[PDB]
Design an enzyme around this catalytic site. Sequence first.
Site, mmCIF file in Angstrom:
data_model
loop_
_atom_site.group_PDB
_atom_site.id
_atom_site.type_symbol
_atom_site.label_atom_id
_atom_site.label_comp_id
_atom_site.label_asym_id
_atom_site.label_seq_id
_atom_site.Cartn_x
_atom_site.Cartn_y
_atom_site.Cartn_z
ATOM 1 N N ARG A 105 -1.041 10.994 1.474
ATOM 2 C CA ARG A 105 -2.005 11.757 0.686
ATOM 3 C C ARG A 105 -1.922 13.259 0.899
ATOM 4 N NH1 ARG A 105 -5.289 8.099 3.150
ATOM 5 N NH2 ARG A 105 -5.940 6.276 1.934
ATOM 6 N N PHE A 121 0.852 -1.182 0.000
ATOM 7 C CA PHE A 121 0.000 0.000 0.000
ATOM 8 C C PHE A 121 0.895 1.242 0.000
ATOM 9 C CE2 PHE A 121 -3.980 2.152 1.047
ATOM 10 C CZ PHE A 121 -4.861 1.392 0.327
ATOM 11 N N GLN A 160 -8.981 15.264 5.547
ATOM 12 C CA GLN A 160 -8.132 14.622 4.551
ATOM 13 C C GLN A 160 -8.772 14.668 3.177
ATOM 14 O OE1 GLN A 160 -7.507 10.410 4.137
ATOM 15 N NE2 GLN A 160 -5.390 10.670 4.763
ATOM 16 N N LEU A 211 -15.216 7.011 -5.835
ATOM 17 C CA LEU A 211 -13.849 6.737 -5.436
ATOM 18 C C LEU A 211 -13.279 5.555 -6.204
ATOM 19 C CD1 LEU A 211 -11.836 7.628 -3.052
ATOM 20 C CD2 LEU A 211 -12.413 5.404 -2.187
ATOM 21 N N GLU A 267 -6.657 3.022 -3.855
ATOM 22 C CA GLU A 267 -5.221 3.245 -3.910
ATOM 23 C C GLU A 267 -4.462 1.983 -4.262
ATOM 24 O OE1 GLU A 267 -4.964 7.021 -1.035
ATOM 25 O OE2 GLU A 267 -3.861 5.246 -0.387
ATOM 26 N N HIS A 311 -8.694 13.082 -0.529
ATOM 27 C CA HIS A 311 -8.227 11.926 -1.264
ATOM 28 C C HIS A 311 -7.823 12.369 -2.666
ATOM 29 C CE1 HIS A 311 -8.271 7.629 -2.520
ATOM 30 N NE2 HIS A 311 -8.188 7.400 -1.223
ATOM 31 N N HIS A 349 -12.471 13.316 1.922
ATOM 32 C CA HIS A 349 -12.563 11.883 2.172
ATOM 33 C C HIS A 349 -12.826 11.511 3.625
ATOM 34 C CE1 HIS A 349 -11.950 7.691 1.395
ATOM 35 N NE2 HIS A 349 -10.906 7.627 2.196
ATOM 36 N N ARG A 359 -4.208 10.659 8.312
ATOM 37 C CA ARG A 359 -4.461 9.232 8.443
ATOM 38 C C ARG A 359 -3.680 8.463 7.396
ATOM 39 N NH1 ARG A 359 -7.978 5.182 5.997
ATOM 40 N NH2 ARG A 359 -8.547 6.639 4.326
HETATM 41 C C1 FAD Z 1 -15.313 5.938 0.017
HETATM 42 C C2 FAD Z 1 -14.538 5.432 1.205
HETATM 43 C C3 FAD Z 1 -13.548 4.499 1.034
HETATM 44 C C4 FAD Z 1 -12.794 4.036 2.120
HETATM 45 N N1 FAD Z 1 -11.821 3.111 1.894
HETATM 46 C C5 FAD Z 1 -11.143 2.702 2.926
HETATM 47 C C6 FAD Z 1 -10.154 1.761 2.732
HETATM 48 O O1 FAD Z 1 -9.899 1.307 1.632
HETATM 49 N N2 FAD Z 1 -9.451 1.332 3.814
HETATM 50 C C7 FAD Z 1 -9.684 1.799 5.025
HETATM 51 O O2 FAD Z 1 -8.995 1.348 5.917
HETATM 52 N N3 FAD Z 1 -10.619 2.713 5.280
HETATM 53 C C8 FAD Z 1 -11.332 3.150 4.274
HETATM 54 N N4 FAD Z 1 -12.317 4.084 4.470
HETATM 55 C C9 FAD Z 1 -12.593 4.625 5.809
HETATM 56 C C10 FAD Z 1 -13.494 3.725 6.582
HETATM 57 O O3 FAD Z 1 -13.951 2.727 5.729
HETATM 58 C C11 FAD Z 1 -14.745 4.423 7.087
HETATM 59 O O4 FAD Z 1 -14.477 5.765 7.313
HETATM 60 C C12 FAD Z 1 -15.141 3.737 8.380
HETATM 61 O O5 FAD Z 1 -15.304 2.362 8.062
HETATM 62 C C13 FAD Z 1 -16.419 4.260 8.973
HETATM 63 O O6 FAD Z 1 -16.883 3.256 9.898
HETATM 64 P P1 FAD Z 1 -17.502 3.738 11.269
HETATM 65 O O7 FAD Z 1 -17.818 2.604 12.159
HETATM 66 O O8 FAD Z 1 -16.626 4.804 11.794
HETATM 67 O O9 FAD Z 1 -18.864 4.375 10.776
HETATM 68 P P2 FAD Z 1 -19.993 3.836 9.805
HETATM 69 O O10 FAD Z 1 -19.546 2.511 9.331
HETATM 70 O O11 FAD Z 1 -20.332 4.890 8.817
HETATM 71 O O12 FAD Z 1 -21.215 3.670 10.798
HETATM 72 C C14 FAD Z 1 -22.362 4.452 10.442
HETATM 73 C C15 FAD Z 1 -23.602 3.812 11.000
HETATM 74 O O13 FAD Z 1 -24.005 4.528 12.182
HETATM 75 C C16 FAD Z 1 -25.400 4.490 12.335
HETATM 76 N N5 FAD Z 1 -25.861 5.843 12.490
HETATM 77 C C17 FAD Z 1 -25.370 6.928 11.872
HETATM 78 N N6 FAD Z 1 -25.978 8.034 12.225
HETATM 79 C C18 FAD Z 1 -26.935 7.629 13.136
HETATM 80 C C19 FAD Z 1 -27.909 8.324 13.861
HETATM 81 N N7 FAD Z 1 -28.086 9.634 13.788
HETATM 82 N N8 FAD Z 1 -28.702 7.608 14.678
HETATM 83 C C20 FAD Z 1 -28.516 6.292 14.750
HETATM 84 N N9 FAD Z 1 -27.634 5.537 14.112
HETATM 85 C C21 FAD Z 1 -26.862 6.276 13.312
HETATM 86 C C22 FAD Z 1 -25.957 3.788 11.107
HETATM 87 O O14 FAD Z 1 -26.178 2.426 11.366
HETATM 88 C C23 FAD Z 1 -24.827 3.882 10.100
HETATM 89 O O15 FAD Z 1 -24.879 2.727 9.281
HETATM 90 C C24 FAD Z 1 -13.063 4.538 3.398
HETATM 91 C C25 FAD Z 1 -14.069 5.487 3.551
HETATM 92 C C26 FAD Z 1 -14.790 5.924 2.488
HETATM 93 C C27 FAD Z 1 -15.850 6.952 2.736
#
Ligand code: FAD
Lengths: 134, 238, 593, 144
Positions: free
Chosen positions: C287, C120, C241, C253, C256, C243, C354, C400
């Site tokens: 990045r 990576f 950040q 998106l 990478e 991207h 991002h 990050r």
């Molecule tokens: C396009 C993209 C590509 C990425 N690619 C990678 C990658 O290749 N490798 C990497 O390591 N990371 C990557 N990331 C980063 C990472 O994947 C995410 O940022 C991270 O997984 C978000 O997970 P989380 O648990 O923080 O939140 P989320 O998984 O977004 O959890 C959100 C959940 O919270 C709940 N929720 C939200 N708001 C409320 C509310 N008001 N009331 C009740 N429930 C609610 C819902 O269930 C929702 O599904 C990427 C991010 C993005 C956006």
Amino acid sequence: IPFLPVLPQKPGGVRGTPNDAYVPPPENKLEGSYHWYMEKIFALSVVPLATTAMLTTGPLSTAADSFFSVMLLGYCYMEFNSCITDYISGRVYGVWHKYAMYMLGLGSAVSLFGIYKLETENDGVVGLVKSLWD
Amino acid sequence: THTPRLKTFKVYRWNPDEPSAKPHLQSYQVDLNDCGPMVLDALLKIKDEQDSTLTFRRSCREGICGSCAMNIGGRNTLACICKIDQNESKQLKIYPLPHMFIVKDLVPDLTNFYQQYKSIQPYLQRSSFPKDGTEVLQSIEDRKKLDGLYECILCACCSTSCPSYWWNQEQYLGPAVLMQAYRWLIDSRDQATKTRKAMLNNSMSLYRCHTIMNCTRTCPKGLNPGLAIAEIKKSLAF
Amino acid sequence: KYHIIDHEYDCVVIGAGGAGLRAAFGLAEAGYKTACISKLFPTRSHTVAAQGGINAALGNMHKDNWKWHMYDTVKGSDWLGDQDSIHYMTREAPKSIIELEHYGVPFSRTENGKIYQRAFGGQTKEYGKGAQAYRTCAVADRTGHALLHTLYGQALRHDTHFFIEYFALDLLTHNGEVVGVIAYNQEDGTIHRFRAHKTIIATGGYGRAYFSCTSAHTCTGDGNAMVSRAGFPLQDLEFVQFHPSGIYGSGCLITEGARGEGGFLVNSEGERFMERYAPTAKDLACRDVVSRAITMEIREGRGVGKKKDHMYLQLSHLPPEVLKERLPGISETAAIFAGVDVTKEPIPIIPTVHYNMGGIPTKWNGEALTIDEETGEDKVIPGLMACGEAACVSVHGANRLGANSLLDLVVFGRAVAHTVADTLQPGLPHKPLPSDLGKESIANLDKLRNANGSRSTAEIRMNMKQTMQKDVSVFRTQSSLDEGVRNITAVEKTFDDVKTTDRSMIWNSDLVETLELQNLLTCASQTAVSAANRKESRGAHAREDYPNRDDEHWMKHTLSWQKDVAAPVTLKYRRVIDHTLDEKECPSVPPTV
Amino acid sequence: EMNTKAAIAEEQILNKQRARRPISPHLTIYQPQLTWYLSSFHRISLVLMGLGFYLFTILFGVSGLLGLGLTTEKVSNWYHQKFSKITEWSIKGSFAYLFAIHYGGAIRHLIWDTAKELTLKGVYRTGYALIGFTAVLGTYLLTL
Ligand SMILES: Cc1cc2nc3c(=O)[nH]c(=O)nc-3n(C[C@H](O)[C@H](O)[C@H](O)COP(=O)(O)OP(=O)(O)OC[C@H]3O[C@@H](n4cnc5c(N)ncnc54)[C@H](O)[C@@H]3O)c2cc1C
Ligand code: SF4
Ligand code: F3S
Ligand code: FES
């Protein structure tokens, strides 16, 4: 299906919450896996024995026609049976799923005797269907 | 300069605070020039600049969560991949998923679908792990068998196009759940398959399939839930 | 008027993503009555869209040691990360990936029979002086999608009461400590009032505050604003950040891995960005330096495009069977939004928003934080924890590292589940509270429902989105940042003249999407304010008028307070930790360049 | 105990609304495709030709126990006098193709339960050959 009575159903299609699992019915492989064997047996038999019913000039022999006339009964029984459990089911009709499975009893056990009056007195069922025409 | 072209969308409507009304179709005229090349880009322009009583589900706009699956123009497909044809003489009809108890406008009640996914036990069921604490071993030609099975997004565009699931949907598991009962059969590290191949051996859970494959035809991710049923049947007999 | 329904649990979890699910069956595997509240079905989140890998020092492709993985994480943050959380997240990383294979994740295998690791961007072995390292531990192009569908099947093994499609509104606070939430049953139209002992916020990031982001549609900041409406701070909100690879116009998106195995950022003239205008020596760097490389190239004029705010990237040099086995899902997301395949011609590229390296300030063991307003020390909030993207442990700091945020969820979700088991006992009665507990949020749900003004709730959202793309961007100075603070206060003040045309209560998708604008103005006003008070440039926060990093006056995090929409913002600071958990297991790195 | 009165007080206000939801339409909007137009002519073609196999044998069965004495040449000459001349062909022309789309449809189905040709390219190329086989076998049975 008109003229039948309907059991009282679930309000909306579901009862409970998405973490209430669906409890499956117990293993009843006389209605499950064995019934798949008694459907392929009657399908692998009425396909070759109907191909030797256009490539024959006269009638068939009574031996080669009696084996063809039981297998055409089991083939049409296993397709009228699955049109019972698909449409006149038991959640929505109740006891009339079992009565309409008994009309495939003594409405098909007298069809087996009706073959016995076509294999001995007259000549076969391919002798009948050619006799009319087409 | 930009002479406006007008296509006419025809969206299904209901409003459960007046359930005495009948569900109908309403016509919206969308200026096709300042609009994106997909249908979700046109169903969000209606909610912003016109009647915003319209409700639907959407989350990512890429095609990987399965939350805006509807019946667009005749076939079940995802509304952020389905493309508007740039021909402003014909109309477009947008319906919910067929034969579901709908909730407000284009939102079906997928509660019975989440109780049937829970009941094929979607988790690994070994009994022993290697002694130095490392991972379990699996060769490449056993890892090749899962390709085309684990990448289903659970949208139910296959289940709600299958005439046996239109009628017996309370006891038949559907083509979406019967493929995920097969992703856990052919996993090479899942050593309890005498129980996974025993809850399917009743009258109507697997055997209400007649091989009328609308499923393989209308999956938008390009998978094959119709072949993956006919390997369970070939395994439950043999 | 409203139905209030009460519940009584031991640890409620908000959010069912990759990080709320891992801390909701580590809790139910110990005898606790866990409950997970989610707005979407748990396999429709934003961690279904991750497509990279999970960094872990397994070393089944070469020699590896986790002490080197600690060095690239702290160098990649420009020394703003808490250096005791880097020691914890990197030590427990081989254990929390092998554990993730015993749950049944279909990891891509190798010819040995072990887990395949690609290469990576940003990690090199032997302490920053050596060859590139191979630590990513990947499924093909669906690492995020195969991580949700396994953790959700594993959280069906134990009992865990999912409350799917509930919208959480506010935290129930009383005498300076939290006791539960108050949600809103979206399918039916009743108000639910959960009461717990250790409520855990794992909602997610805010990305939709900008005009063109790569986030989902549901990634409004819903857990950063619930905390800040109770009086608690939010930490390091100005570090956003960018991207370097997002499709023009839509914002989708590409991974990478498109530059992890062979990739040429191709200008208008047709060269590789290695030197002589914008780039450093080694390519495919972090990045921060590769996105500011691009925005100055299109500013000078060396950028291909119809309007020439646009770029290229080829994928034609690769063999076509390694574009199929290792990267198959990218090939469809480039043929339907761009209409150009990935084997003959380049694809359009722009930089877009991002990831957000800020949120609720946290210890390394999951508990939230604040400051005592006299001595300025740390002080835990009693009864509140946080994990995921909506929590700032500052293990990422200012930038990050790539493919490091999926290790953030598994390691610090496992840690939250263990530190409740050491402190709270299972089974304990609840203190009696008054009958109008949570009466301020029912009065605020009611006000937005019977709204009638002049401006629609999709027009105020366009004034906010066009302001923060223009001013609070990749290149910022203290003559346009001050224009952003004046504008984002003007858009805040006109929220009391909003118009809602849907008075229904069953699936109101106009009352939910006008509460997602109230949450996205509290998160967005402290981003332009907290960036106008940082006179240095490190990481992904670059100033045009102070182009050097000040290690002696700006080695501190930033905390921010704002109670409601259109309220004054105050800021205070706290010292960043600079010592590990064990001085003999690993020594802390010194701040260099 | 709480949480038990919460799954009863919510169900009674959920089941009151849940019983007034409509059903979205399923037929009369779905797209005419080849996959459910050929396997709805295979379920029909055994009901119609299956009733003509049952009904022509109970008549030889209920006249077996009850003394009637029905012979093959008796019921055949009864058939020809009954219907009109254009009717004797229209039953003969309908039942000619209904045999051939099922005889060609039983051969097709037995490949599919050995999991072969179950792709999307194979369902269409063994579904166009079903349309050719009907028009050249069912036409050959009309000349005889
Ligand atoms: C396009 C993209 C590509 C990425 N690619 C990678 C990658 O290749 N490798 C990497 O390591 N990371 C990557 N990331 C980063 C990472 O994947 C995410 O940022 C991270 O997984 C978000 O997970 P989380 O648990 O923080 O939140 P989320 O998984 O977004 O959890 C959100 C959940 O919270 C709940 N929720 C939200 N708001 C409320 C509310 N008001 N009331 C009740 N429930 C609610 C819902 O269930 C929702 O599904 C990427 C991010 C993005 C956006
Ligand atoms: S099989 Fe295809 S259509 Fe069916 S749920 Fe999975 S992705 Fe959707
Ligand atoms: S359409 Fe239905 S009948 Fe089987 S082949 Fe597909 S699940
Ligand atoms: S929004 Fe994720 S599938 Fe259309």
